[PDB]
Enzyme design. Structure first.
Site, mmCIF file in Angstrom:
data_model
loop_
_atom_site.group_PDB
_atom_site.id
_atom_site.type_symbol
_atom_site.label_atom_id
_atom_site.label_comp_id
_atom_site.label_asym_id
_atom_site.label_seq_id
_atom_site.Cartn_x
_atom_site.Cartn_y
_atom_site.Cartn_z
ATOM 1 C CB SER A 66 -0.940 0.342 0.846
ATOM 2 O OG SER A 66 -0.710 0.915 2.610
ATOM 3 C CG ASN A 118 1.522 -7.044 -13.754
ATOM 4 O OD1 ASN A 118 1.947 -6.710 -12.587
ATOM 5 N ND2 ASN A 118 2.663 -8.067 -14.137
ATOM 6 C CG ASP A 144 2.296 -18.285 -15.216
ATOM 7 O OD1 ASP A 144 1.181 -18.949 -15.543
ATOM 8 O OD2 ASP A 144 3.287 -17.578 -16.218
ATOM 9 C CE1 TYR A 163 9.993 -15.811 -15.816
ATOM 10 C CE2 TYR A 163 10.179 -15.786 -12.907
ATOM 11 C CZ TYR A 163 10.311 -15.398 -14.316
ATOM 12 O OH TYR A 163 11.057 -14.592 -14.670
ATOM 13 C CG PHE A 210 8.958 -9.748 -14.501
ATOM 14 C CD1 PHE A 210 8.500 -8.570 -14.302
ATOM 15 C CD2 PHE A 210 9.594 -9.979 -14.717
ATOM 16 C CE1 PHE A 210 7.419 -8.908 -14.845
ATOM 17 C CE2 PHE A 210 9.114 -10.514 -15.765
ATOM 18 C CZ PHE A 210 7.962 -9.949 -16.045
HETATM 19 O O1 LIG Z 1 4.565 -9.123 -11.939
HETATM 20 C C1 LIG Z 1 4.901 -10.577 -12.380
HETATM 21 C C2 LIG Z 1 4.373 -10.854 -13.818
HETATM 22 C C3 LIG Z 1 5.276 -12.643 -13.543
HETATM 23 N N1 LIG Z 1 6.367 -12.535 -13.803
HETATM 24 C C4 LIG Z 1 7.166 -13.641 -14.420
HETATM 25 C C5 LIG Z 1 6.695 -15.029 -14.301
HETATM 26 C C6 LIG Z 1 5.810 -15.196 -14.812
HETATM 27 O O2 LIG Z 1 5.248 -17.446 -15.118
HETATM 28 C C7 LIG Z 1 5.825 -14.853 -16.190
HETATM 29 C C8 LIG Z 1 5.396 -14.489 -17.142
HETATM 30 O O3 LIG Z 1 3.739 -14.214 -17.080
HETATM 31 O O4 LIG Z 1 6.713 -13.462 -15.845
HETATM 32 C C9 LIG Z 1 6.654 -11.984 -12.967
HETATM 33 O O5 LIG Z 1 8.223 -11.473 -12.838
HETATM 34 N N2 LIG Z 1 6.040 -10.575 -12.523
HETATM 35 O O1 LIG Z 2 -6.025 -1.223 -0.025
HETATM 36 C C1 LIG Z 2 -5.373 -0.966 1.120
HETATM 37 C C2 LIG Z 2 -4.363 -2.061 1.632
HETATM 38 C C3 LIG Z 2 -4.618 -1.757 2.861
HETATM 39 N N1 LIG Z 2 -4.838 -1.480 4.046
HETATM 40 C C4 LIG Z 2 -4.762 -1.645 5.321
HETATM 41 C C5 LIG Z 2 -4.563 -2.781 6.252
HETATM 42 C C6 LIG Z 2 -3.510 -3.431 6.043
HETATM 43 O O2 LIG Z 2 -3.369 -4.564 6.767
HETATM 44 C C7 LIG Z 2 -2.440 -2.572 6.354
HETATM 45 C C8 LIG Z 2 -0.850 -2.342 5.583
HETATM 46 O O3 LIG Z 2 -1.242 -3.011 3.597
HETATM 47 O O4 LIG Z 2 -3.167 -0.966 5.658
HETATM 48 C C9 LIG Z 2 -6.110 -0.767 4.212
HETATM 49 O O5 LIG Z 2 -6.542 0.001 4.327
HETATM 50 N N2 LIG Z 2 -5.926 -0.462 2.711
HETATM 51 MG MG LIG Z 3 1.492 -15.446 -19.527
#
Ligand SMILES: O=c1ccn([C@H]2C[C@H](O)[C@@H](CO)O2)c(=O)[nH]1
Ligand SMILES: O=c1ccn([C@H]2C[C@H](O)[C@@H](CO)O2)c(=O)[nH]1
Ligand SMILES: [Mg+2]
Ligand SMILES: O=c1ccn([C@H]2C[C@H](O)[C@@H](CO)O2)c(=O)[nH]1
Ligand SMILES: [Cl-]
Ligand SMILES: [Cl-]
Ligand SMILES: [Mg+2]
Lengths: 143, 130, 143
Positions: free
Chosen positions: B63, B75, B81, B84, B92
């Site tokens: 947050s 994303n 997956d 991976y 990443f």
């Molecule tokens: O935020 C993301 C999303 C995907 N991947 C890697 C793992 C996943 O299997 C592959 C294809 O989406 O890329 C990441 O490292 N970060």
């Molecule tokens: O969208 C969000 C994400 C987090 N929190 C609060 C609850 C969570 O346990 C704390 C730390 O992320 O902040 C929220 O109220 N809203």
């Molecule tokens: Mg894919």
């Protein structure tokens, strides 16, 4: 094992498929779409589905959606409830373009999975919780 | 108790840890990263993992990531997956900066959990729904 | 049903309660909020909760939030940790405005569900994984 029934907008839609190395299933643009920088478009996906009873679908971008198409998904993650199962209940991807972009018909722009809906809950109002505060919003720092 | 096997990029990566009041586990920038306003950069996380059989992982921002670092995750929720899990399959965080920013090596910028994958399903094409 | 204990910030907050059978639950702005284009604001939601034992909550925008208010959720999907159950652990929706906007007190802006948290896991450092590489970040292309 469980069945998802899928209805396509028309015969020209590219049928979706599961790939071995993809834990979610890619969804596809139903038409070519042009979006200007800093503008919005609800991109049709050209599918309607009847999910198993008690399930919902979640839709998110691919990791590569921004690099390939220049968009983010404005609702973060879309939720498709089991009840959204009518013959004309087609799915859409809400795209905000961060650069001018062209999406082509059939392009794999997002991905979905199903999972069970949350259990039945009852919300009970209280006047006081009696718990220590955790804190939030970066209470634990960054280092 | 399930195991997650974690291979770090190198000895300089800060080893990740579970905290009692964090239901998801914080992941860390592998190096210093500068991102300019309205630019994208894939922030390396310095970890490759083998998850338990049948599981995927999900990655979302903290947050406080936007206040601290001025980035959104393009994303929304990343899906790691199960396949991976190679020695070069390092995770990443796909960042888009809404202001000029600097992220420092070791900084906790996102969080992850594991989840059972969707089971095998049959996609049955139909002419009409019910 | 599993019980969620809910405490409102004050008597003016719009109550949720109703019969709940699995659908995501809408949350509401606790006060009027004005956000300028390209600025950020917490949007207070005016609720503190104690979730069932072993559960977290997930918060995303409603499907209509971008149309209605011009905001995206900066953390995409918020995770409410189970320990965020104190009397002053009020939930928030982190909003970035892509246009000038007004949110009114009581307006539905995001939605939540509960989910069982990840169980205790052992993190085991290894020197070598020994699997083939999948590749990622768009390795499967777009077509
Ligand atoms: O935020 C993301 C999303 C995907 N991947 C890697 C793992 C996943 O299997 C592959 C294809 O989406 O890329 C990441 O490292 N970060
Ligand atoms: O969208 C969000 C994400 C987090 N929190 C609060 C609850 C969570 O346990 C704390 C730390 O992320 O902040 C929220 O109220 N809203
Ligand atoms: Mg894919
Ligand atoms: O990203 C989303 C989320 C929801 N829906 C469907 C299901 C929902 O009931 C309806 C209205 O939001 O649209 C989509 O097509 N895309
Ligand atoms: Cl999740
Ligand atoms: Cl969820
Ligand atoms: Mg945290």
């Amino acid at each position: 094992t469980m069945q998802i029934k899928i209805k396509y907008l028309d015969e020209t839609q590219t049928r979706i498929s599961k790939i071995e190395q993809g834990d979610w299933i890619d969804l596809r643009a139903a038409e070519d779409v042009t979006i200007k920088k800093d503008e919005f478009k609800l991109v049709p996906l050209g599918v309607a589905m009847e999910l198993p009873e008690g399930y919902e679908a979640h839709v998110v971008p691919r990791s590569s959606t921004y690099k390939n198409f220049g968009v983010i998904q404005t609702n973060s993650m879309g939720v498709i409830d089991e009840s959204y199962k009518g013959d004309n209940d087609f799915w859409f991807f809400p795209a905000y373009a961060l650069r001018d972009t062209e999406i082509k018909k059939g392009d794999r722009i997002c991905q979905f999975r199903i999972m069970k809906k949350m259990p039945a809950v009852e919300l009970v109002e209280v006047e006081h919780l009696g718990n220590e505060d955790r804190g939030g919003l970066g209470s634990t720092g960054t280092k």
